[PDB]
Design a protein around this ligand. Structure first.
Ligand code: JFD
Ligand code: JFD
Ligand code: JFD
Lengths: 285, 266, 280
């Protein structure tokens, strides 16, 4: 489980970070599919490798450590997480939760996140943006909920509600910004379902998930969202449709990570612009 | 914690049998309204979990309460062990297996649940007639691990898990006492928890054929059926699930008491 | 013991010192395949107990090497089901060893409940797809660091049940007079060890599932991950009870009996399939 995401450990990490930077983030951004360039474009940044933060969880992309990036974006103070902790990697609940709880103590009020997802809904097109308006946490309904274990009262309640988990005001703003900027047609809202992974979904699985009312399927994000809502951080989440789910076994169509990465790199520029323009218009401030 | 094997369970049961002469035939786990019941058991002996070696401990320390209720010898279990708290399979199972060794023939369980079925109202009683054990189908079944053969078989059937005869009687008792309009029978689905269910989740669960949702009870029911204890269980509907993002306690304890009065006795 | 390239090579090498047979087909005995090892000619039998670091399972399991239908095979007698408490690495290691040993095709049988209302006791349901409930729910056998010598981080499962093998299996059945017994269907894994409730069966049927069992999928995922072609068949050992009022119920002794009844046929079917596999 590594180090417990309790108030004492989370404070020690926040304080270490606060010695490394004077940027107090209002907005946290977890870089997923399509956000690689956003991460790169933060103004007046300070980059802190995970390896330099005692008790911060460790992750790499082929040996290269993840980073926390502080600075501004559209004139608002941000922390960007470049490097995520996916459960199919075997990370514990505490490992995944600790960074989100650190954001809470640093001052984050709003969390923005992207991911790659397979398009289940038959109206979706490759490269579409699907704003999350709800989710189905399959691991969580099992006994693999990120909050399973003693509750950390300092951060939230034993039985958190997930009613308005995907803040309806942030969703309205995101849609407006897309419409205003000419790409409203690329933007949908939908139900995201988590497959613990790391296998792509079989056609029978995709058919089942579609019939359950799911619009997109992915392997990430929900656990971070749950920790965020648990501690009162407002959440905005987007899936980039990186492949269209195959519903028939007798198809030679096949999911592959290469094409998922490619759709991500191709949409990165537009996704960056969307996020920067949302941020410019975020409520208050 | 300690493996819920026959030796560890025998140890605990044998200890309790030195503290009470009461051989319980009915076991009761009050989840929803109340406690109380326990309200009312006579000639009672109260045993803190903390005074029972190798017994699981709460995280108000729980109690086993022995005595007579509606003329029958009972053990009431006050203080539950839920999987969302992080308890192990063995921890959750041990208390139920201890009941088996003490003489328990019938387990009666109450809980609070969210109403999925759109015909349900706040305060309705939903007798479980079946369940969907999501964690169990997903490789988190309380029986995963070596089978404890002294207690039951490797692949238990869950046919008549919620004894149909006990359900008929419970319905008869409710109807005789004028609250039969509050009683439904339904399928309970376990959400591992501890998050409440999203509207998308609730919609899927309803469409899976589920009537109520909760985070408990099924693990205990599985262990009870595995060792041949008959089960009766009821959900109190304590909220109505939202499907789109866009003193009842006292009636229940009274119902349980009146059922026990009419239970068969060997 | 991690199912990584180092540990798996060590096991494979030990095995290679005990047999010169380089298997091209690996077979996992489940329901109906009890007799299969007996047909194996020029066989050597290697108890799991005699293989350092190979996982161990109860009257010790065996690896049987030899010739079946003119082809080199390794038969696995004794499996590792997740409801017994086995680890991901424990289940995956034997499959990865098969791969290092030269296996190109895995054939597997299992017992399953018949969800599809047209199924009959003793029918054969060739798997053409699956629903891995434990895998959707974060208990996927591949969870953890990906072992790159074996395969990719995100394996696809689109033709997991090799269609061509499926076509041959059906052809063999039809030409041998038991085509009426054979179906193709979707298998759903229940992590187990409980039989499914009536409400659970109804839900699974409505999910598009034809049969339900507690095995096989984890091994299939590992095989596919390392590029082994898979053929898998469920024997319908009991008809799922969907009606909570019903008197019918699954009985494990009847399940065993049904599987054993079909053993001779299942054997013949597998042998005749292997006989017709394209060789070069
Ligand atoms: N990027 C994708 N594509 C897919 O088909 N299923 C998934 O879980 C992810 Br992540
Ligand atoms: N009491 C409730 N209400 C609900 O909507 N969901 C639950 O899991 C429980 Br417990
Ligand atoms: N043999 C069976 N029968 C059934 O109804 N469910 C199962 O999971 C297995 Br294995």
């Amino acid at each position: 489980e590594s180090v417990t995401a309790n108030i004492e450990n989370v404070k020690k990490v926040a304080h270490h970070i606060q010695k490394l930077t004077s940027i107090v983030p209002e907005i946290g951004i977890i870089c997923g599919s399509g956000l690689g360039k956003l991460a790169d474009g933060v103004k007046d940044k300070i980059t802190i490798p995970y390896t330099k933060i005692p008790n911060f969880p460790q992750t790499s992309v082929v040996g290269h450590s993840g980073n926390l990036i502080f600075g501004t974006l559209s004139g608002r103070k941000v922390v960007v997480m470049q490097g995520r902790f996916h459960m199919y990697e075997g990370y514990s609940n505490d490992t995944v939760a600790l960074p989100i709880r650190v954001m809470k103590l640093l001052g984050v009020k709003i969390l923005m996140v992207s991911n790659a997802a397979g398009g289940l809904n038959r109206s979706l097109k490759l490269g579409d943006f699907v704003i999350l308006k709800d989710h189905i946490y399959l691991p969580g309904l099992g006994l693999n909920n990120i909050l399973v274990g003693p509750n950390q009262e300092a951060f939230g309640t034993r039985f958190p509600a997930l009613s308005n988990a995907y803040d309806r005001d942030l969703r309205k703003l995101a849609v407006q910004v897309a419409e205003e900027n000419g790409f409203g047609n690329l933007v949908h809202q939908g139900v995201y379902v988590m497959n613990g992974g790391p296998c792509y979904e079989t056609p029978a699985e995709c058919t089942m998930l579609l019939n359950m009312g799911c619009d997109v399927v992915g392997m990430s994000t929900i656990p971070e969202v749950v920790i965020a809502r648990h501690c009162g951080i407002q959440v905005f989440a987007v899936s980039l449709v990186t492949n269209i789910s195959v519903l028939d076994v007798e198809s030679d169509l096949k999911p592959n990570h290469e094409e998922v990465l490619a759709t991500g790199a191709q949409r990165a520029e537009l996704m960056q612009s969307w996020f920067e323009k949302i941020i410019e218009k975020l409520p208050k401030d």
